[PDB]
Write a protein that binds this DNA or RNA. Sequence first.
DNA 1: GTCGG
DNA 2: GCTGATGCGC
DNA 3: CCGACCGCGCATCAGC
Length: 326
Amino acid sequence: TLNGGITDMLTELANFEKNVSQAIHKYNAYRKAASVIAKYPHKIKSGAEAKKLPGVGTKIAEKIDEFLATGKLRKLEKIRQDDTSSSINFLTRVSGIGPSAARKFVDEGIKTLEDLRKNEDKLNHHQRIGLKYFGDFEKRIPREEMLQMQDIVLNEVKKVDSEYIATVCGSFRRGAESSGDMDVLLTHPSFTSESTKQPKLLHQVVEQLQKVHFITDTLSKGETKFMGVCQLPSKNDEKEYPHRRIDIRLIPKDQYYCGVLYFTGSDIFNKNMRAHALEKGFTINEYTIRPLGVTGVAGEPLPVDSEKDIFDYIQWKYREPKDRSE
DNA sequence: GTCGG
DNA sequence: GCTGATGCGC
DNA sequence: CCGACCGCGCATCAGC
Ligand SMILES: C[C@@](F)(P(=O)(O)O)P(=O)(O)OP(=O)(O)OC[C@H]1O[C@@H](n2cnc3c(=O)[nH]c(N)nc32)C[C@@H]1O
Ligand SMILES: [Cl-]
Ligand SMILES: [Cl-]
Ligand SMILES: [Cl-]
Ligand SMILES: [Mg+2]
Ligand code: NA
Ligand code: NA
Ligand code: NA
């Protein structure tokens, strides 16, 4: 929060470009600037000082100067007053509704929470659940609750098959005191990059979690990725907990390290690391790290026995999960 | 919007 | 039905 | 300048 004012401004600009302008690269440009500045150990005194940081160019340096001088940004001020921009931005807050769907709904005159509710007939499944838990999904999850959720998930998975290994990733693994949702990496010995010896490996787990009333809704579900909703059980007479977003990713057991690296993030950390990888002649995904041939085509997966090996390949000193919150 | 070749 | 492009969220 | 901007699972749709 040393430069919270500036980072908030840049984040609002990023969201505008993504949601309204549908300019993904501008969105990322702003996110990166925000990220590099949030990391800066000094209270920024000027745009010039900020421009010294990679990702902060002339345009953002000018904005920072305006913000520092007046405490606000006219460009944003105008965006906030724009009804269409505001409506589109709002709708995209519903899980399942992106920049395209938001603009379309706005064209059809659907611009508010009240509108969405009286038009649930025009929403797909995911959007319908996002609307249902709109408020809850806005709430953060105290680490204390994440621990209870972890306890439930691991024990229930154990009951299904003792050979399953569930690992909570996301900001939780990065040591955050609160998280926006729960991300679970799952592995089973029967499923490797070599073969799938048992079907419904993910299904069984999802089924067991619904059975004990932990998982309450499903946004989408495939053979390797589950995206849904869960809720901690409450005690007698006590107000029940808010519903929470939960993602479960089944990854080949032999590709655990690339998988946990990916699911631990952050998202910007992953983007920066994958981009650095390319520069170094490698490509990284949640499964492997492969070298790039003379032409630029990915080669065969390189041997990996720890997260550190991945860092070593691209000549990066190792960084503990807690230092990957970019 | 920002960067390196 | 399929393949491929797109939206969306990660 | 001017191309590059991470990489991918699932839902949905068009076109066949
Ligand atoms: C935002 C959080 F801090 P919280 O959920 O606690 O509020 P976190 O859990 O970190 O993110 P979230 O749950 O959206 O996605 C989980 C991981 O997926 C990976 N991931 C997400 N988005 C991307 C992306 O665009 N690219 C890549 N490569 N990985 C991504 C890295 C992410 O860490
Ligand atoms: Cl763009
Ligand atoms: Cl691995
Ligand atoms: Cl791969
Ligand atoms: Mg998360
Ligand atoms: Na700069
Ligand atoms: Na959304
Ligand atoms: Na998530």
